[PDB]
């Protein structure tokens, strides 16, 4: 039992290590998207690599109007100690808030409870209207690929604005490359018409598409994926 | 009301365009993992890109010991025509079964009827392991096609963590901190934390953050192959090939 | 559990391959009867034969002021492909709408999920008059196509019964007792009965069995034409012509 | 709330003017099919036309292995008096049992209490096979006599499909596409589809639409004889001969 | 579970062979009493004998201002055919209405679905005054015809009790203690009892047993006429002169 | 919520002025029928006239194999005083038991608290056979004494009907159609109805109306005598001597 | 479940052998207390001795401003015969009302159906003040007559208690510690206990045990006259002189 | 909600100032009766007067085989301090046990929480026989001390009635009608009543009012001494000599 895609993020006050805030209102009222990602506990290695991975892509997220907020079943005092430790031993400052959810009240509300005591790694991509657009549930033992969350919100924003659907593997789809899909006709009249305009490349009346995204939108999406695939030049346990 | 990560795949008989099968027994019996991915409807363009994308990675999945299985609310007859259409117009044959779920009985049972459908299933993905246990769930929206290379990464990483008895860091195999590193599961008692620090037998940043590099050079280069492909601009689009 | 004869057609929005319509309002509005027929699935042979048969008889229904609407548990996109297929391989355009009912929400509301079904909807037929009231319901098995001419006979006889104030005998217009004669609703009181008999204004076998012949020759021969067609061996099959 | 197609006929004892019998057992145990037809009341003109029409086709049903049973909400005494009257004034003996259902316990168990109805039984027909299974249900209104030859066509065609393992096109034996051809149940797997098309043992318009012509000239002709009878003006009206 | 003596007759619309009427309103509105008798079924011998007996005493009822109304679980068409048979074969016209209660809605409302038959109403009588109040109820078994003269006596005696403020002793007007005398209602207080005995105005056996003879010689002899008729061997039986 | 005709008399222990007894067991065990009659209260005039009228007929009841038992909502000490009053002032010994029902437990079980009641028992009568089965119920108003000769006619006819296998016409032994004839219970199937007529073994008016005269002269005369005793003014009133 | 010391006597209408009255209203209206005593049945020996004992003390109760009302589960007609019997055979007029509680409505309302009954009301006494509040309840067994002189002592002492604001010692006016003294209600706070003691206005044994003698000599001698009378053998027994 | 006369005393373990005991078992086992009296609270004046009054009649209770047991909603430590107080200040040792009922558990169980308290127990008395059956209950208000001699008289009179199979008249042994006579329980059948009267075995006023004088002269004078003591002005107050 969870919230559903297309539903509005459930209304709640939450305590973070930045203060008390109202969700989704806090982000909606700033016209901001948010990514809520949860963690089973403070001072755990997979969750720390993820915090560091998100911090790294903080600017990338912000440039798309996306705020980040964590969730862990540990108090605010542990959250601040954990963060301090990250900055001192890894050298990276973790700039976004983390919800303190001892009791797992928030976790329960979101159905994030293998768990019993510690909260699955759930991720909710919520748009500027408060609406849940995506949910990823990775297991406790597996860290997220954070560059895929960036690709999602980028593709999603471009779909919402260009009035287009986004092909598998976009912007590198095998069939239509960086093309974007015109939502299929839903009546025979609409189908005939669309087939008679010849205004789109097409494979059938229900598969038409064009290339409306800017060159920079495509290269930015491709840049997320490129970074996901690169062998890191020098690791951060060395920097330490 | 969805099934839960770490629960057994709900026991059920399903009708596919390859016949009637029992989930998850049918894959467990073979000691196979399976990826179940749903689709709102046959003859829809995003969902057709995804089939094509899945069929391309079909051998990659086979190599890992993973089977593929679809789910659509359409009938088995639509599934077959849709697949015939893809093979004829795209030039790609779809090798894996599609559950025919008219009425949405299977979709319901899996909580795949979300708040933008009421009628067509969300893009749900269930990665179920050889023991028939759900290990990952992905819910993409209707308008957004999956990145199938990430599905492969997950199965690959989860099979490694499982075999090597490790946890897998963000962005593996390209984690900013420990690169190809895999993580030793943290001590949960005070003695165990002390023993672990005195053993000097792992690299480490703290007693709770220890790791080695126990993954074969081929295990790793294969994980990066997935991601590199995902990053590559296709040379030749299949639309032109038609 | 079902709609009932004499009941108003339940109010509902439905999505068809021609768009979203309101039942029964859309037809009541226009002063039209409608015949709603349900089909287990797209790209099935019996149900394709029936589509063709209703398309052939499309003008007959227009003359009667009857619109036709189909229902199948399959997405709108399948409905459209299925119609392209019939037009392309049989050479008959299907001009009427088909409700897309993935989930079987409409099918369920109408009680069209029966015990040989579970997945796909019974072959159900609702004959609904211009007032939105159900007048006849037919439930044929999934393996047996309908006799479309009988649906025509029913509407025509019922409209004749409504307007002439008459009940229609078995097998009309070929009843073995009274041929094309129409029945006067029987008296429900003893004084009514006694008056009917003394009036001698009707042919009669008893006070409860009185009839006359008020249908025009045209009405009679139009109704017989439907059964005559149904009886005729076709003079050229569409299979060959294909 | 009704019995459903594919559902077993509800187990019940009924009283008729032939005696008390158990349904569907009484007929199952003889290897008989049966048609149960319900009537609003005794001594009503539409229902008398229907009884005479069934009685007239009595031997046709018997040759098909099909028994007839009526159901009216009136006592067994009224039934016999009613039958006696039909035999005296119309000259036709009604050879089959009629259920006496005062109280409407049976009507109610069967859902034959509709919304024009109140107290008198909808005009419902159940065609039940020799396994005791409901195969077809027809609901005509109070004011419209049934077409009894369509009932014979139905059981004839269902018996044919059952024994030949075939589906039956619309308007059989005069279907516009395939005439008197019967349909091969479509393939439900990709492998069956491909194999069906490789075999080349059937006429087909597609892998899901294959048929042949396995019905005997006699069976086809018998079916056409039912429809020709329904279509032709009778020579001699039983009222003239009163 | 039944309505009760002292209670108002249950409000209800009913259909009879003379029309639709509201009970007890149709009768109260005329300032008339009514006797409602019920009958298991039409075309039954005991029940026919009863109808004939009531028809014979019809004017005796009208002299008392009492209308008769029957009830049988059988349709209006059967009732009329049943009446028709009686007039034809026995020579007696049944002038009063009969409720057609197919389904037994009225029967259940009145508790007339007793144990000998869950299908045909017990043989019950409700005697109902001009205020719509139930004054008497009789339940005979289905095998035993009523004594209609005793119903006349009850109405007559009860109209007298009411109009004279008197109670009626056993066997009136032939009581073995006081003959045709009528009983003064007993005092309910010690002061009334004392006053009654000091007044010396009645014949008395005790303060609680007082009586006088206030009924006209006509009232008394009318009541005794009923008992005498019941006691008389009939002159000429109706079967003979059929 | 009354007991019902055809039902077993509800099991119960009761206290009478003759002792405690189990109903209907006390009478079933003796092979006896019984008449249970209820009374609103002790020391009341109508109920005193009934007790006397029943006492007069005690021997008529014993000869039929029938016991009498009263019921009143008053203690056993009232019953005995009341009886002693009747015997001292009227000169009639009341031989039968009266149930003492203070609290009205028995009265509620039998549903005898009717609308005029609340506190005093409706005046009801149950005629119960030697199987414990309720065969008749009369409900007379508080103000109207019963006619005891009619209760003796009912059991006499019920017994003859039970043993001869016959139904009893209205007003028996003086029915206007058939006099002292008894009715052969009607056929319930066409075959029975045909055989009955074929046989020609009975007087008849129709297949559903056959009768004969198998009751003895004595049975007939005993029953006519009850009716005669009801009809005649008694020579000598008891208040005279009393 | 019963009424309670300190609760209002339950609101109710009751039928007595003097007429219908409202309790406690009827006595409350007059500024009177009343004693209600119940009796299991009329024409019972203990309960007669009681009536007689209360009758003898009727003037004593009147002087106190107290009415008496009896209660018996027997009809009003029995009450009156019983009372007549007492006046006639014993020579004493029972001047006060008796409630006729047939069915025991009043008895259930008051909880007087105890275990040794189901049928007959316990021997219970309610003493109710002029405000309608129950002050005392006594429940004697059916086999033990009350001591009516103790009931007078209770109300006389309760009247002194209420008007003098005093509590009444055991066995008053003959208490072993303080004789005819009356008890000052004890202090409930420490300040109150010190105050009472330092003011030295009462005889005392402790701060919680103070008393005085505020009752007049006539009040005292009156209360003691009830008890003397209870103790003395009557100079004349009523049975001898009967 | 109290226990009821006739019902066995509710089984229970209680703590008293003499130890823990099971009720009624502890006294039943000894063949003793017990009187259980309740007190709202320790160190209250009316309740102290009563304790003393009981302590005074202690051997009178022993002579009858009756034990005494008090009950108060106060700890066992208060009970004992209260007893010491009475012994020290009044000179009277209280020999019987008092139940300590802090919380009111026993009191609730026995319905001893009435509507003038909710905190402190009503002043209730239960007289319980050697078989553990409740024979008498008395409820005085709190402001009114009991009359302990009336309690001795009840138990003495009850034990005599029991042993002699007699009922005891009002005011016994000083009944106005029959003096010290005891009542023969009344006959409950007509046979008993007639036999009783035929025997001339008793003095009688009627068949239901018979008596004799079976009590020994010592039983009679012992009972009357109880009452004489209650009527005697005390020759020396306990407070003076305190």
Swiss-Prot record, chain A:
Q: Which Gene Ontology molecular function entries are recorded, alphabetically? A: antioxidant activity; identical protein binding; peroxiredoxin activity; thioredoxin peroxidase activity
Q: Mutating residue 208 to S leads to what result? A: Abolishes enzyme activity
- Provide the GO biological process annotations: cell redox homeostasis; cellular response to hydrogen peroxide; hydrogen peroxide catabolic process
Keyword Kinase tagged:
no
Q: Give binding positions for substrate.
A: 121
Active site positions, chain numbering: 47
EC number(s) for this protein?
1.11.1.24
Q: Which residues form the Thioredoxin domain?
A: 3-158
Q: What else is known?
A: The active site is a conserved redox-active cysteine residue, the peroxidatic cysteine (C(P)), which makes the nucleophilic attack on the peroxide substrate. The peroxide oxidizes the C(P)-SH to cysteine sulfenic acid (C(P)-SOH), which then reacts with another cysteine residue, the resolving cysteine (C(R)), to form a disulfide bridge. The disulfide is subsequently reduced by an appropriate electron donor to complete the catalytic cycle.
What this protein is reported to do is described as: Thiol-specific peroxidase that catalyzes the reduction of hydrogen peroxide and organic hydroperoxides to water and alcohols, respectively. Plays a role in cell protection against oxidative stress by detoxifying peroxides.
Please state what the protein is called: Peroxiredoxin
